[PDB]
Amino acid sequence: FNVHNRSYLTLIEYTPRQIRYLLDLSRDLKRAKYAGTETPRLNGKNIALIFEKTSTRTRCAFEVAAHDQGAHVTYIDPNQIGHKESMKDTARVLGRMYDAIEYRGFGQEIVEELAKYAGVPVYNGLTDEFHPTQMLADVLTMHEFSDRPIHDIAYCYIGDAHNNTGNSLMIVGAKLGMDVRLCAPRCLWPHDELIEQCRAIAATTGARLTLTEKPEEAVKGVDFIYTDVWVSEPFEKWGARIEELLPYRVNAALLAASGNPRVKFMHCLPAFHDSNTHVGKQIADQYGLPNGVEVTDDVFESDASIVFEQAENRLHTIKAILVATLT
Amino acid sequence: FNVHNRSYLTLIEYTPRQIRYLLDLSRDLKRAKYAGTETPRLNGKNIALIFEKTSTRTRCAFEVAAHDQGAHVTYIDPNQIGHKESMKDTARVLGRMYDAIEYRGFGQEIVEELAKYAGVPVYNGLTDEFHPTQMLADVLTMHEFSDRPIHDIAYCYIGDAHNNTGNSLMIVGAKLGMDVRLCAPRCLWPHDELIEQCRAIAATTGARLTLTEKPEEAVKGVDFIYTDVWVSEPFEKWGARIEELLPYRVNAALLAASGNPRVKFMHCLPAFHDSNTHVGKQIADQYGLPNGVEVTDDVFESDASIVFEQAENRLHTIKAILVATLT
Amino acid sequence: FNVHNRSYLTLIEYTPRQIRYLLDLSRDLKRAKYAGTETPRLNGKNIALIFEKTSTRTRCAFEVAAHDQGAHVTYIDPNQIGHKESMKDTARVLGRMYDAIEYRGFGQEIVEELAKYAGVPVYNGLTDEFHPTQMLADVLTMHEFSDRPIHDIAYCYIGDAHNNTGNSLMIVGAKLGMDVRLCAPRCLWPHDELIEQCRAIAATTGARLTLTEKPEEAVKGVDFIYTDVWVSEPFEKWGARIEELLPYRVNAALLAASGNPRVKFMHCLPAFHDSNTHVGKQIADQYGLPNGVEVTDDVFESDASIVFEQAENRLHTIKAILVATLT
Amino acid sequence: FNVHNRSYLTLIEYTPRQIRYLLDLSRDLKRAKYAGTETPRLNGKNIALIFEKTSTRTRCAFEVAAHDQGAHVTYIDPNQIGHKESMKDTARVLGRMYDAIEYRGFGQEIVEELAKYAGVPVYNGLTDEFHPTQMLADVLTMHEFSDRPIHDIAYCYIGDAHNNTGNSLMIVGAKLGMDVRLCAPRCLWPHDELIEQCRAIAATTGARLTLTEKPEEAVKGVDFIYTDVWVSEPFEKWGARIEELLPYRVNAALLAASGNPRVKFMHCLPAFHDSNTHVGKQIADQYGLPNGVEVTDDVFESDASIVFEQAENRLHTIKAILVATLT
Amino acid sequence: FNVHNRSYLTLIEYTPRQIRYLLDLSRDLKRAKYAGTETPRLNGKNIALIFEKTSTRTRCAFEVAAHDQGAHVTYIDPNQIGHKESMKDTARVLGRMYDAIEYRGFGQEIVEELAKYAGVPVYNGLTDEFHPTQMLADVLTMHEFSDRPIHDIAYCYIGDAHNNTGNSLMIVGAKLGMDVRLCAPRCLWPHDELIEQCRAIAATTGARLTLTEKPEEAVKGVDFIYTDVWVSEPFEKWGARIEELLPYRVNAALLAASGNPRVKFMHCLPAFHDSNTHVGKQIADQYGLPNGVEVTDDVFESDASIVFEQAENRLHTIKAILVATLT
Amino acid sequence: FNVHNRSYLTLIEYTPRQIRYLLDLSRDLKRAKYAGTETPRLNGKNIALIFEKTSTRTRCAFEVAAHDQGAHVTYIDPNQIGHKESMKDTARVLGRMYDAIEYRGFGQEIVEELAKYAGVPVYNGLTDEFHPTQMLADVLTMHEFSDRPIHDIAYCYIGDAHNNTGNSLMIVGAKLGMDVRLCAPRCLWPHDELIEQCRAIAATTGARLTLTEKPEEAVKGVDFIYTDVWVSEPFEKWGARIEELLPYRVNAALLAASGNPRVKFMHCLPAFHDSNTHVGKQIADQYGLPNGVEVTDDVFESDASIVFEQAENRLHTIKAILVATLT
Ligand SMILES: [Cl-]
Ligand SMILES: [Cl-]
Ligand SMILES: [Cl-]
Ligand SMILES: [Cl-]
Ligand SMILES: [Cl-]
Ligand SMILES: [Cl-]
């Protein structure tokens, strides 16, 4: 019962042993779903889903995972917590009605208060600082597409690194002993406090945390290249960060710069890889990036891309979290 | 397995044999629900419901039908696909999480791309061009209220005919060999390309497709008179189309003009038949139509009206679609 | 089958015998949920939930209660009935698809029309005049925290008394013979018509209905003190009613004025007891009430407060309503 | 839930839409029993059966129908309600123990009081005025043996027409729009009050109610000829009514007088068609009618007779009533 | 297993501890039936029901209780044990076929012989001396309508006290320590032998057994007033006992004589409270008691009357007896 | 399927092979009931029980056997077939409602007509000529109390031999090859036609049928002595037959006359063995037979008596008949 009745706010609060137990559980549940061996063990359990920010992958992953294990789910639309009722008051009411709460919002303060007073497991769909449910899916995808042990895998996240995606990517790789590389301008590196935490963790696990501004050096010898949108947010901010992050675009030459023909590409999504989105065409017109913003359409649709296999693993990893905490 | 694992985008892609198989299935499932013989055969199946346009009849029909067969359902509120994430990207993620997708939106292009990349059955709740789920419910209702074969039934749709409702009403009647009549100004006839497709279909099935501008001639000898709202859309457009469609109002004299005392009245809904709706009173005040816009309150509430029996059959027909494609 | 197949619009339409049957049923279902003896008896039943006003306690109570008894539920977001489709038309469509309807909106006229034409049980989550689902939870909470019979319990609601919360609190206490006290300015007393109805009811049950403007006299000898927000509504109205209701604030001295060390405090929620809500800080800044608007933070968080036990009983009482009307 | 939780006292209180829903339900349940698709949906439900008059068809139909749907049944033998305990008192005790009551007795007053105070659905096995459970079976039998719509069917009841059998036969045919003919002496016509009710109903449904004294005119063009025993009752009354009803005997010439070789014969039973019953031989000896009283043995045993198919449909129609009111 | 495999002939053979265990069990089973938590634990068990005297409440209570716990039941109509076959012989045959026997007859000798030789539990529906199944229902009803402990409850039975109803009412109250009062002429007091048994029992339990001829003194301070019919029996005997029992009629003044506004009224039933019964009008005509014999119609139908809640508790108490002896 | 879908009217229509198959089946079902291995295989099957004559053993045996195999049963009280409705008409209605019919009446003609027209298996509880269900129980009892093969068993029936009990006892023993002896006055021997049938059967099976008037010779060497009541019937007939049957009384000396200390005694019941029955005392008073009519109380209650084990086997043998014909 190491993970029994535990909240899932960030992987910092988890040991490597526990993280790899959740990766193994996600593997077995994914296989059980395909093979038909899956048996529901959360029958009649209700899970509230706070979603102050919109979501497609995380919401659906929670709903289907829940239904596969016999649980029900209540989806709370953004259409306003903290406006008429405090987070502390809301936590103490949902905790007496629901067996678990998921929270997709703004501050780690908010979800930490939710966990403090809820009295039931609380999960972090995404905050401004961390995004741990995504990290479980990412490592599972890398393991599936890797012939080697998890601690021998190397990967480079490139782009806005001080956002929640880069923060948790640093944590997970340091936890599991793998070779992590964050590549970005020093303006967009994670806060030095968090970097220092992960340097200490890497000492105890053999992980190789490196932060650099030079892309061609960050991708050399990696198995996977990772990127995310450069803005979470007003349109005007795009102009500022496009100047900073222009050399960090993920194109065919970048994957070639790794020197690894087996290298794959990952993206937590949503992604701007073409001009077939409303805001995507707004960036392509004013700033002249028609065939992708942070990744080329070619790279995104190439055989090296595994972004959709990564997206599907959100279902199985979140399902593992539900089973490990409620059973 | 003629209909096994098939998308339902429009009835053009369906043979008459398949359409009547779905009508028969809707009849048996409707009877099984009342009699208690219904047995769930979609247990644990998840269905995503894209709803970019609001809906009461279609959403509820999907939810209850799904729950009656043991399936679950995720309702995606309008509150924005195509804004941050492309339809192609969304299709490839939901297709790995859900057993089927429903789409209620704008363009047949959108739902056709959804079907192309989803990898799972995709259903069309409504597009701007077609509305095939409604057509199945309409024909089932006519068959129930008809003592004669489906190919002997006659019906006239009157009003805005180039919208999705008139388009699919032309298709279904041509498929099933029945006597179809669209009555409207030539400004509001369906595009000649679609008319010509249905003329060709009617040749092979014995259907009698006729398009006319004269109401008293379109209703003579029909078993059912059909109408829909004249605007889908800004308020200002009402003034233009009210002038065009004023003589096409459905009143007691019109049903009398059919010459059939057994004639019934149908409406896909929502309908403006009185001044008890917010926009309905706005039309009644400025344009002076207090007792109904496209149909009189008397006609709508008369014993000849079967609009609510038609609405209920949405549950059973959609249920037939779910069973025939997922089983 | 006294309560079989009955709508739940207000407790005026219910006898004391029936109300206490629902309180007893809520007690047994609450105990059955904890003890594991609960057995689902609403399997496959669908319940539509109209929510024109936002809700946390009522929506979740319906969802979880429904799922505990094996029923499904469709949550209709505010994002507009009565705009394009009348309430009468909507009732006749949902009544053929759903086994029951809940309505959370504005006027008793709206939910009464829903019950008239739906053909299935209709429940009142909240209207402007009544809020009967809350009343069942309140009396259950008082009974649990009372060593004495229900008809011997005394309680005082203080604040805006002509709102839906004070109206139904008058009704329920008069029905059950208990000592009821509404304390407010005469401007904010319930309409004299409703007061006179409850005076007549109190004659037949032994209830002691008293309405007063003096707080220290209304709380003397009561077991529970009750309060609610002073505005449902624009911000500007707060200034007017804060002047009226300033002496009716619930502070430590008020509970002391009861003279009962066992006295408890209740609140239907949401509540403004601190400056940790968006609108709550707006009131605290302009009007200078930092530690609570209608109740002190101390009182709200004191051991005397039972507001969260009251909130949880919404699940069990609503569950009792579902079982008693659908079984 | 049009028929949910409703008593079944006479078809006057039922709309045509509801009656045809019960005919459809009887058809589906009859087919489900043969095909094996029937699934019990009344498990654990108890039904009391008041039988102040003896019964074979109605009692057994209730018992087997109940057992097929998983319900139990308590048969109260004639061996005396209203002797030591009032009907009102009995209703309020059985209503708290049983989910439904059936009543086979004397006056519509008795069963109407039972329904008033029972609090649960009450069914009328037979009263002196009406016999609605039989009517459902009769129309189902006619529909099965008719190639044409129900409203096009013609039938003639001949014999004692002011009894319960003729009364309800007038009601049902008027409800369903069919061509009804009662043939009897004016002494034995139904009360003019009831005739006038059914004339008004026939106006709104297209039914053709005709009452005549001439047999050869009443049977011309009918699909079914119906008859019943001429006395319910002392033996002495037979002499009086045999003189009146002698020309109304159902013999081979009468069916020939219809002019329809497809014509069938119906009888609610019990029937005196031979001298193989104790009272049947008493009539045959004194009054000299050896080969049948109201119908010839030849006609009763001819291929045109469908009285036993009619008797079997009592099971399926009563079963439909149980399902439609208790589910 | 204190009550396991035990016959239920009279409460004299039961300790107070066992009686209150059966009252508690009846409470839990009554609540389990309403709440849906009831689970059958007598599946496939057969219970023979000897009924030499007619019965409505006891027969139905046995049938429905049995069916609720999954047992079956065989109802033996009065239409003669002891005529061709002895009770001893019958007991030894039914004991090898049935899991339990109920007996409703004449002498305690008969049911005691049944228990002696049956080899299975035997229950006493009613004898001339005792009626213990009724007593369990009566005490349960008093407890439900009492805010105080069972041993503090006071009640007065008034009328024919030496019948089976008064005899067992004396026993049960003495067993449970409550304040019992039998009020009747000394001609109709129970036999002194039984009175002396209950005086001895009352010594060990604190019960206050008092027998008096003065009504106004017997009702002072009681919570419940109880009465029964004055004859079980020829019509001629009514004249004799009406003279004796005229001052013991239960009217509004009598309940007022208790001095307790909370006082309730009870009656095992059947009751003569109006002229709407065959024998009831015979008494009203000859003896001039039109508005009730032993209780006024006003009192019987007043809010103080709880006779029907008492009747319903026959189901739950008998059910408790079945469960406690067969499980 | 030798016995599949077959009526059971008399054992004459059954081969020895089939009879011993039913004896074996009764043995296995009796053992399965005690051991808990019994599994219901008649679920949902309805069995009508015509009982024109009263019955305790046969009715209960049918009810409990039916319920043990999951079947239901409808008990038709004597309170008149053949009075208003012919047997042929009744058979054709019950055959379409019930899976089987039992008949307990007067003439083999009646039950043979029932089987002819019913269309479903018909069983003979008892007629005036035969009583085959009893015979199966009798042989099973003899086999259980016999260490030797069935064809080596010897038994003597003594008393009124031309009744149904003696008739079928002759048939069964002749079928199974056992040594049968009927002992009675020649006035009360079975009809010579039936005797001659059984002599022919005994030739083919080795049975030893002997009819004698001398008791001491009929009992010599038998394993079982059998007797039944001397009148089925007015009281006056007893005087006539008591004179005839006085020397045929079953007393201790008679069992001694067999010369077999292991000899047992059997009686189909009801039996007059003492003065503890209403009619039994009438015979004892007028005719002076206080300690038994056809058997002494001593013999009936002696250890040699096995009448109650014989009675219990009615359940298991009838159960075998139900299983062998309906499965
Ligand atoms: Cl490129
Ligand atoms: Cl009009
Ligand atoms: Cl304070
Ligand atoms: Cl003829
Ligand atoms: Cl009075
Ligand atoms: Cl002897």
D188 and D120 in contact (C-beta within 8 Å)?
Answer: no
Structure tokens at D41: 């949906």
Active site residue C60: no
Residue with tokens 């049923």: C25
Beta strands in chain A (DSSP E): 46-51, 72-76, 100-104, 122-126, 154-158, 179-183, 208-212, 224-227, 264-267
Asked if omega into C16 is within 30° of 0 (cis), the reply is no
B69 touches chain A (CB under 8 A): no
Which H or E run contains C50? Answer: strand C46-51
Experimental technique: X-ray
A99 and A283 in contact (C-beta within 8 Å)?
Answer: no
Q: How many CA atoms lie within 13 A of C250 on its CB side?
A: 36
Distance D270 CA to ligand 4 centre (A): 19
Residues of chain B in contact with residue A61, where contact means CB-CB under 8 angstroms, are: 97
Strand partners, E86: none
Which H or E run contains A89? Answer: helix A87-94
Alpha helix positions (H), chain B = 16-35, 57-68, 87-94, 108-118, 132-144, 164-176, 192-205, 215-218, 237-245, 252-258, 278-287, 297-301, 307-326
Sheet holding C72-76, edge to edge: C72-76, C46-51, C100-104, C122-126
Catalytic residue numbers of D, as ranges: 104, 131, 134, 228, 268, 314
Mutation target among F52, F87, F89, F110 for the D interface, most CBs of D within 10 A: F89
Q: How are beta strands C208-212 and C179-183 bridged, if at all?
A: parallel
**Integer Cα distance of D267 and D157 in angstroms:** 9
Could you tell me which residues come within 8 angstroms of residue B203 by beta carbon, excluding any fewer than 6 positions away?
A: none
Residues after which chain E is broken (C–N above 2.5 A) are 79, 232
In this structure, which amino acid lies at residue F192?
Answer: D
Structure tokens at A1: 């019962």
Asked if omega into A270 is within 30° of 0 (cis), the reply is yes
Structure tokens at E204: 């060990």
**Integer Cα distance of B117 and B110 in angstroms:** 11
Burial class (CB in 10 A: 0-12, 13-18, 19+), A244: middle
Structure tokens at F184: 């009675």
C173 touches chain D (CB under 8 A): no
Cα Dmax for chain A: 55
Q: Answer whether A touches E (≥3 Cβ pairs < 8 Å).
A: no
B156 and B222 in contact (C-beta within 8 Å)?
Answer: yes
**Integer Cα distance of B114 and B106 in angstroms:** 13
How far is A112 from chain C, CA to nearest CA, in Å?
Answer: 15
Q: Which of B68, B259, A316 is nearest to C98 (CA)?
A: B68
Q: What is the dihedral of CA E5, E11, E15, E20, to 10 degrees?
A: 90
Q: How many CA atoms lie within 13 A of B321 on its CB side?
A: 32
Q: Which of C322, C327, C319, C316 is nearest to C30 (CA)?
A: C316
Q: What is the 3-state secondary structure (H, E, C) of chain D?
A: CCCCCCCECCHHHCCHHHHHHHHHHHHHHHHHHHHCCCCCCCCCCEEEEEECCCCCHHHHHHHHHHHHCCCEEEEECCCCCCCCCCHHHHHHHHCCCCCEEEEECCCHHHHHHHHHHHCCCEEEEECCCCCHHHHHHHHHHHHHCCCCCHHHCEEEEECCCCCHHHHHHHHHHHHHCCEEEEECCHHHCCCHHHHHHHHHHHHHHCCEEEEECCHHHHCCCCCEEEECCCCCCCCCHHHHHHHHHHHHCECHHHHHHHCCCCCEEEECCCCCCCCCCHHHHHHHHHHCCCCCCCECHHHHHCCCECHHHHHHHHHHHHHHHHHHHHC
Residue with tokens 């069942």: C136
Q: What are phi and psi of F77, to 5 degrees?
A: -70, 150
Question: What phi-psi label fits residue B215: left (phi over 0), alpha (psi between -120 and 50 degrees) or beta?
Answer: alpha
E81 and E134 in contact (C-beta within 8 Å)?
Answer: no
**Integer Cα distance of B70 and B43 in angstroms:** 4
**Integer Cα distance of D53 and D56 in angstroms:** 10
Please state, as a whole number, how many other Cβ atoms lie within 10 Å of the Cβ of residue B315.
27
Residue with tokens 């599946």: E43
**Integer Cα distance of A315 and A113 in angstroms:** 26
In this structure, which amino acid lies at residue C302?
Answer: S
Report in angstroms the alpha-carbon separations of C43 from B67, B109, B319, C47, E70: 10, 40, 18, 12, 21
E189 and E165 in contact (C-beta within 8 Å)?
Answer: no
**Integer Cα distance of A74 and A64 in angstroms:** 12
A63 touches chain B (CB under 8 A): yes
> Does the CA dihedral D183-D186-D191-D193 come out positive or negative?
positive
**Integer Cα distance of E292 and E183 in angstroms:** 19
Active site residue C131: yes
F59 and F103 in contact (C-beta within 8 Å)?
Answer: no
Q: What are phi and psi of A63, to 5 degrees?
A: -65, -50
Could you tell me which residues come within 8 angstroms of residue A18 by beta carbon, excluding any fewer than 6 positions away?
A: A2, A3
Partner residue facing B74 (CB), from A63, A79, A315: A63
D62 and D73 in contact (C-beta within 8 Å)?
Answer: yes
Distance E293 CA to ligand 5 centre (A): 11
Q: What is the 3-state secondary structure (H, E, C) of B45-98?
A: CEEEEEECCCCCHHHHHHHHHHHHCCCEEEEECCCCCCCCCCHHHHHHHHCCCC
**Integer Cα distance of F92 and D309 in angstroms:** 10
**CA C175 and chain centroid, separation:** 15
Distance F254 CA to ligand 4 centre (A): 65
Which H or E run contains A324? Answer: helix A307-326
**Integer Cα distance of F141 and F158 in angstroms:** 18
**Integer Cα distance of B293 and A276 in angstroms:** 40
Residues of chain E in contact with residue C39, where contact means CB-CB under 8 angstroms, are: 36-37, 39
Structure tokens at B150: 């489906």
Cβ separation of B46 and A54 shorter than 8 Å?
no
Please state, as a whole number, how many other Cβ atoms lie within 10 Å of the Cβ of residue E15.
11
**Integer Cα distance of C104 and C125 in angstroms:** 5
F118 and F48 in contact (C-beta within 8 Å)?
Answer: no
Distance F299 CA to ligand 6 centre (A): 7
**Contact map slice: B 123-152 vs D, CB within 8 A:** 147
Name the 3-class secondary structure at B242: helix
DSSP single-letter state for residue F268:
-
In this structure, which amino acid lies at residue E288?
Answer: G
Sheet holding A179-183, edge to edge: A208-212, A179-183, A154-158, A224-227, A264-267
Task: Using only the alpha carbons of chain A, give its radius of gyration.
Answer: 19
Which H or E run contains C102? Answer: strand C100-104
Q: What are phi and psi of F54, to 5 degrees?
A: -65, 155
Ligand-binding annotation for E18, yes or no, is: no
Name the 3-class secondary structure at B8: strand
Cβ separation of E97 and F61 shorter than 8 Å?
yes
Q: Which of B108, B168, B115, B111 is nearest to B138 (CA)?
A: B168
Name the 3-class secondary structure at C212: strand
Please state, as a whole number, how many other Cβ atoms lie within 10 Å of the Cβ of residue F11.
24
Could you tell me which residues come within 8 angstroms of residue F97 by beta carbon, excluding any fewer than 6 positions away?
A: D60, D61, D64, D312, D315, F46, F48
Ligand-binding annotation for D269, yes or no, is: yes
**Integer Cα distance of B89 and A51 in angstroms:** 22
Own/partner pairs, C2-6, CB within 8 angstroms, 24+ separation: C2/D119, C3/C324, C3/C325, C4/C324, C4/C325, C4/C327, C4/D5, C4/D120, C5/C121, C5/C325, C5/D1, C5/D4, C5/D5, C6/C121, C6/C325
Distance E144 CA to ligand 5 centre (A): 26
DSSP single-letter state for residue B229:
-
Residue with tokens 């005994």: F202
Cα Dmax for chain F: 55
Q: Which of E32, E9, E60, E10 is nearest to E320 (CA)?
A: E32
| Residues composing chain D | 327
Q: How are beta strands A224-227 and A154-158 bridged, if at all?
A: parallel
C121 and C101 in contact (C-beta within 8 Å)?
Answer: yes
Q: Which of D228, D236, D222, D310 is nearest to D273 (CA)?
A: D228
Please state, as a whole number, how many other Cβ atoms lie within 10 Å of the Cβ of residue B262.
13
Q: How are beta strands D46-51 and D100-104 bridged, if at all?
A: parallel
Q: Which ligand is nearest to the CA of D251?
A: 4
E318 touches chain D (CB under 8 A): no
**CA F94 and chain centroid, separation:** 26
Q: CA triplet A175, A181, A185: central angle to 5 degrees?
A: 130
Alpha helix positions (H), B95-131 = 108-118
Q: A156, A183, A198, A268: which is the annotated catalytic residue?
A: A268
Q: Answer whether E touches B (≥3 Cβ pairs < 8 Å).
A: no
Distance D95 CA to ligand 3 centre (A): 55
**Integer Cα distance of B321 and B81 in angstroms:** 25
D88 and D113 in contact (C-beta within 8 Å)?
Answer: yes
Burial E125-136 (b: 16+ CB within 10 A, else e): bbbbbbbbbbbb
Task: Using only the alpha carbons of chain B, give its radius of gyration.
Answer: 19
**Contact map slice: C 297-316 vs A, CB within 8 A:** 308, 311-312, 315
Residues of chain C in contact with residue D324, where contact means CB-CB under 8 angstroms, are: none
Alpha helix positions (H), chain E = 16-35, 57-68, 87-94, 108-118, 132-144, 164-176, 192-205, 215-218, 237-245, 252-258, 278-287, 297-301, 307-326
Burial class (CB in 10 A: 0-12, 13-18, 19+), D136: buried
Q: What are phi and psi of B51, to 5 degrees?
A: -135, 90
C116 touches chain B (CB under 8 A): no
In this structure, which amino acid lies at residue A234?
Answer: P
Please state, as a whole number, how many other Cβ atoms lie within 10 Å of the Cβ of residue D13.
11
Residues with CB under 5 A from ligand 6 (ion): F 251-252, 296, 298
Name the 3-class secondary structure at C124: strand
What residue in D sits closest to E314 (Cα-Cα)?
Answer: D97
**Integer Cα distance of A102 and A58 in angstroms:** 10
DSSP single-letter state for residue C187:
G
B316 and B63 in contact (C-beta within 8 Å)?
Answer: no
